[PDB]
Symmetry: C4
Subunit: 467 residues, 4 copies
């Protein structure tokens, strides 16, 4: 009579089972797939939220092996600039410089009559027209001569266009130019981040979100043109025709573009996304820390069941599932993977790190940052308006606005969390992320089983970095 499918389960209803293992935590292999064609070094992506991911965090995350997704709550050029920033990220030097009109006396004023390498010569703005060296000047007496009658001319310089160049240097100092022969710096013949997630040309990978409303074409175009590695079409309802249509159109317009579509929480929803053309299915309706959808609307599916149901279909097409929302501890990452996901998307876990947007706030002598639902009033009010234009029709939010404890640097957080994954892989005898994802077993536990799992019956005196 009551129309009810079986009991759906979330992270706290299950525990993974230990198994025979020849795997040590530090030998565990963390590599996995974000989409059919994009590899991750760690099974983490960052949420596309104005309180989690801008260029700063996207770069830091990619350096550690994951991919950040730039949020859409900014203008097109703003978003494209963010992507571009990530794509060109290098860490070049930017030397002291003179004019073709400046005199030798000007130069001697700078050098202080003791030897020097040289000064790149630049025009009114900002053309590079030569160089003057400690050997061009050592024996020039006439302090009145302009730098241009004694400089090494344009053609004797060794240069590169911005964007490894270390190949062309095989000469040991090279001047970076652009398309109008305009100086941008210098690089002088000299791996900090071996787990970096990078594209075929050794650039850091980045993603960016656009959402499903009509009229996104201009935004998509600019993001692809800025070299985005993966496009996320993010919606609170991936099973909506609107979303499927938007995915179809984007697939048809960029047949090689890796696209993530979601969110869904069912087999059917994962099926309709795959049919629309996604390269990856993003799963989660309502499990997010800052989410009130389940309460406001009554709709949702516990996240371990949502994952397994979406993966049941997505596996049949070779399509990876992304588990998005509700990850609170590193043991949830293990569980989301064993349920069928190839990686997890996280907000709160990364929010409040140094790298996330926003400044630190003090509240009762303790450190926090802003963290808010993308569907909260504040996140939505940066709507398209200016409130000058906007106003019986008030928005009904499905997210809250809050504060989250300051976490410090992203790198240490990732290391803490992946530690716990590695240890689970040793416990479950999973060599690779695939083995955890396809072979690990669960048991179902009661509320009393979950209390035994936590710390219990002792006073914690010190905070542990993973708990």
């Amino acid at each position: 009579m009551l129309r009810i499918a079986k009991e759906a389960l979330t992270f706290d209803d299950v525990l993974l089972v230990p198994a025979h293992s020849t795997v040590l935590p530090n030998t565990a292999d963390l590599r996995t797939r974000l989409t059919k064609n994009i590899a991750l070094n760690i099974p983490m992506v960052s949420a596309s939220m104005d309180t989690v991911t801008e260029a700063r965090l996207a770069i830091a995350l990619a350096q550690e092996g994951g991919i950040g997704f730039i949020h859409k709550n900014m203008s097109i050029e703003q978003q494209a600039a963010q992507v571009h920033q990530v794509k060109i990220f290098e860490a070049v030097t930017h030397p002291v410089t003179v004019r073709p009109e400046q005199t030798i006396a000007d130069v001697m004023e700078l050098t202080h009559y003791h030897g020097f390498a040289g000064f790149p010569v630049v025009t009114e703005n900002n053309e590079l027209v030569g160089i003057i060296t400690g050997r061009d000047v050592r024996f020039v007496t006439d302090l009145t001569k302009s730098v241009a009658a004694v400089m090494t001319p344009k053609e004797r310089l060794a240069t590169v266009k911005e964007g490894e160049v270390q190949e062309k240097m095989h000469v040991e100092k090279i001047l970076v130019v652009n398309d109008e022969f305009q100086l941008k710096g210098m690089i002088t013949a000299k791996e900090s981040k071996p787990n970096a997630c990078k594209d075929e040309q050794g650039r850091l990978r980045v993603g960016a979100a656009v959402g499903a409303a009509p009229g996104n074409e201009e935004r998509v175009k600019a993001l692809v043109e800025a070299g985005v590695d993966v496009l996320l079409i993010d919606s609170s309802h991936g099973h909506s025709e609107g979303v499927l249509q938007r995915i179809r159109e984007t697939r048809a317009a960029y047949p090689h573009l890796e696209i993530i579509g979601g969110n869904v929480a069912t087999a059917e929803g994962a099926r309709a996304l795959i049919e629309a053309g996604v390269s990856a299915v993003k799963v989660g309706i309502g499990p997010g820390s800052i989410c009130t959808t389940r309460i406001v609307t009554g709709v949702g599916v516990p996240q371990i069941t949502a994952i397994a149901d979406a993966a049941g279909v997505a596996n049949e097409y070779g399509i990876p599932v992304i588990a998005d929302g509700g990850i609170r501890f590193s043991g949830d990452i293990s569980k989301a993977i064993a349920a069928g996901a190839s990686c997890v998307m996280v907000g709160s876990m990364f929010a409040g790190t140094e790298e996330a947007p926003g400044e630190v706030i003090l509240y009762q002598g303790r450190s926090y940052k802003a963290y808010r639902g993308m569907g909260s009033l504040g996140a939505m009010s940066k709507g398209s308006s200016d409130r000058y234009f906007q106003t019986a029709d008030k928005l009904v939010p499905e997210g809250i606005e809050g504060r989250i404890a300051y976490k410090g640097h992203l790198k240490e957080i990732i290391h803490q969390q992946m530690g716990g994954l590695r240890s689970c892989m040793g416990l479950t005898g999973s060599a690779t992320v695939e083995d955890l994802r396809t072979k690990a077993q669960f048991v179902r536990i009661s509320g009393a089983g979950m209390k035994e799992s936590h710390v219990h019956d002792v006073q914690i005196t010190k905070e542990a970095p993973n708990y």
Copy 2:
């Protein structure tokens, strides 16, 4: 051995499943049925409680698309007057006026020798006997003449009886009279509330409760005579013979009267109510916020199972179910509908609004209103007594007395709550209330699933209007 049917479920044991959808929240259709013949524009009715619904709230609710139920804790004429108030609600002007005995000097005292429209002329009390205009007087010198020798006489006036009249005006100012030609105002040729729930003649709908005890005939009669749209026979035990008898008698006496009977919590109970003649089955034994029945008596049925069981029968006769009690958030409304209800009856959700009875109370520098069970001592003590008459026989209450946070205006609350319904209809791909009610699917969740549903693991900094 132990006599036990299956596990019964309440709101927090279930979540609705998202589905393929061509529905947008703002295109969702909220219309539904209160009874076999009365349509609602929104699936909400207000509880019949002395701390929720009197004329004030009944009018405000009907203007928004629902129906209020006037409570019975007042005299017959009091209750009939409340219904009448709702039925005649308009928002007429009520102009300045003179006597047939008053002189022209009296008039000139009022006008101040500059032009005027006119003054309706009235008797000792309160008959209308004519009009005197700025053109009746402009050239009357004799300030001593009585208004009656120069007034426009009774028959040259254009008038209407109280109770659209805008048809007869096709003349642009019309004088409202009653049956003794007595003046009541004026209306001068001039839609704020398009979702208003209205009867075939464009009057706001209203309901009123009587309860099941013998001797209600006089009360019913007066309520029907006051134009009540729907009679509620409300009881803590709708499956009691007393209640069924009372419903039978009322059906026989008013074969066209829409009658709501309840409350029940079973198939059988819904069946016996339908057999007795109800136009709608009201469901809920014990789920109310202020209810202690379950604890005091040990009896009750979790409300999602109570709804589905009652709807299983009521569907077979085309009879709508009203889900009454236990609605706390807008997601519960979605759930109660998907379980089989056509609308929800709410107390606490509306209590504490400006429109509900009682004044605002301050308690520790914060705003509240009184909200009490109709079976609490205070609600019951307004019994029939005066305590002068009343007293080893003390009442045993099944409701408590309390306070509820001030909510502000009803209109904003309704908009907040229906927002969440609309969003669920988009999530579940339900175009109409019927589709949610008959096609949406649930999953069953654990206590851990319900914690994931809420906000979790972040500090809320601002209160969201729906949470």
Copy 3:
């Protein structure tokens, strides 16, 4: 592999189902059986605990329709005296009196020369030897005569032996004597408590506990000789051979004595008690408010399942079940009955009433009384010792010592609680306790169902007498 029977259930896991009803709460019939041959007017007995039941409460409870069980933590004669007190409870007057040696002047000193009824004449100690009346003296001048030469002699008095006598009075004042013709008072030709639980001779019923250890014979004998109506052999383990043996012996020694045996929590245990000869099976291992057995020992059975299992057997022999422990609200009484019990035994519910032993304690400006497990250290330390005698062998308690809020008078508590029963009987359409016990149905509910049952989502401003 793990040796586990099905899920056992307690009060909060179930709710009763409303049903068709021709029963009104105030017409509900509360009468039930304590044992095969002893009727109760209300389905309550009081626990045999030194903080719940001594004569005071036993009398008050019997007057309301139940039976109190005097505890065993006192000497034999102490316990027999308590029983006796209950058995003889009447509410006699006790007039002013003179000596056969006292003079007329002594009498006139007392009367003050205005008329008087008379003075019963008594010996050195305390024999009754006659009467002197206002008419024996009115005309006796000689103030020196001793009362004995003018008294109405022994044989003209109308008298009764202690222990209705109102039959012999058919004469209107009668002098109460004992076996040595010794005066005890007077009763002068004059129903407050119609629900009183009484024996065939109109005396209040009382029970008394002895426990199962060897050597109880003397105690049993004295209790039977004091007119105890029902003997309780109370143990934390009724399925222990020791207990069954003790029951066997007592049955053989008093074939007509109603005996309660327990506690058990299984079919088997109820069977072995019946076989041993009990007139009633008492059920409950670990559910008591002050009990720590379940935690200390790991043993126990949730009380609704314990009841139904014990009743499954006990029903086949016509033997009533007593549900003992874990009753917190009046809805638990309804549930315990529907699970199969004929009445409930309560401790905390009665503890802290005026009538229970101990004085009121103030603790932070609020009223309490002592309430302790009979297996707590304090209850057990009144062992048999004096601590002078007693002491690597310390007792290991299965009960705690605590305080319970002052409740006031027992009568009001009973009325509050039976109110809730009556209302459940109306809700479930149970005319008699038997119908609730054998025909009412349960549903099983989740933790979320139990939260809906309570008060929720409102601030209680006043305490309700049943909640």
Copy 4:
């Protein structure tokens, strides 16, 4: 689809069932097996943790009938010295003594011219070369003679080598020597601890842990050479090949050594340990009070199911199971045994006793001791380092550091806890630990059943010693 075995259960999900019993708590038999060949007098062992077990507690526990396991967070010789200490524990006297060079005047200086037993004579360091008695001196005048010309020579002494000797005394005072004839004390012809757990030669039993990393051979060798009764190879992952290999090697090197291996939480894991050669299977992955494994890694198995699954296999080979972690109250011990374990290993239950390592700490005017996971940062930092050597590679802890309330003496704790076991054995009619372990039955209970089990609805005024 989701890969899930049945619901696993922990202590609070179950209760034992009372049964027919001829067993009294004080007649219950507590003896059980630690391994195939080592008997315990009580079914308790202490955890191998630097905050629970060093020699002090190992000795106290063995005296009460259990076995302590010395932890490995110390050097080899340190650990061997601890074992040795336990093995030689006696409670000898150590008399006053003189030199062969000291004069009679020196002696008379000590005696004070009144009679004396005698003085054992010792060399430079520390050889025993004779004795001088109150009868050797009574008649020696020459105060200048050296003790050696008047002493009773080496050969007239009655002596024993360190390590019952009371047999050789059959002479009543005997001088304890070593292998270089060096004096160690004296024992003079004189059962406090009858439940002592002892080896075939009447020495207290002790265990010691080594862990599974390569290179443990030297440590094992020294522990065996120090007379360890049982070797524990303890790991957070007993199903890891590394652990199984280490067990294999140790079995092959010491075919008669009793070895405990673990921890596992499955049938398979218990099977692989038995195959590797263990004499006992230790069970528990994640249930420990101070454990965060379940949360950090997501892996674990509720402990009652982990026990029964491991015992299902281990029973088929006659191999005992040790239930390790998550024991909080004495009722958990009963449950762990009935689930299949032969004894329990405890940390927090013993931590904070006088005997456990560490000093008492005051924190807000109350007594505590340190208790920490062996996998917490602090426990692990005593790594092998000195931090001078050690440092993007920080450890990821699976244990926390905390404080636990001071418990007093271990003996009283054990007596409290075994009290509760004994009482359960009476309740379940289990004469021996074997009967509880193989015949007792469980019921499964809800969260509401567990609340009824606890104290509820009363204010505890005094702390009970077992709760």
